[PDB]
Design a protein around this ligand. Structure first.
Ligand SMILES: [Mg+2]
Ligand SMILES: [Mg+2]
Ligand SMILES: [Mg+2]
Length: 65
RNA sequence: GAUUAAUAGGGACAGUUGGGGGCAUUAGUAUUUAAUAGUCAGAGGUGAAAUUCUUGGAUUUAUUAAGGACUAACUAAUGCGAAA
């Protein structure tokens, strides 16, 4: 089934807190989650990942995706 | 036998005032770099782009450290200095 290598013991009440470092440049955008320490990185997405055009790198469409 | 004592000037003294100067000290993020951890495929830059950087892992994230600069914001029809 689903083996989520995330945290062992949760509940529906519980909050699981990640931290999102977001960098916005006129030339791009970065959405980066880590733990509360900032050490261990979970997810990484840049605008340029989501579009092939150099100019669209920053744009809201890209940021959304 | 020595004119006043200039809202003339020099000097003394008293509480201040100042981003004036010279030495020492000392901080602060920031840029750049390095280290140690992470994670991955793109970062940069532009009107678009291309030179660049990138899997030898960049950009990115956390913690330190090195090294030169620089004193933000408060900061003003405010201050000081002969001007710079
Ligand atoms: Mg330092
Ligand atoms: Mg220093
Ligand atoms: Mg003043």
């Amino acid at each position: 089934e689903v083996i989520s290598y995330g945290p062992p013991n949760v509940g529906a009440n519980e909050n699981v807190f990640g931290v999102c470092h977001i960098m916005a440049t006129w030339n791009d955008t970065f959405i980066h989650v880590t733990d509360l320490s900032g050490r261990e990185t979970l997810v990484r997405v840049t605008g340029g990942m989501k579009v092939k055009a150099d100019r669209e790198e920053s744009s809201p469409y890209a940021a959304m995706q």
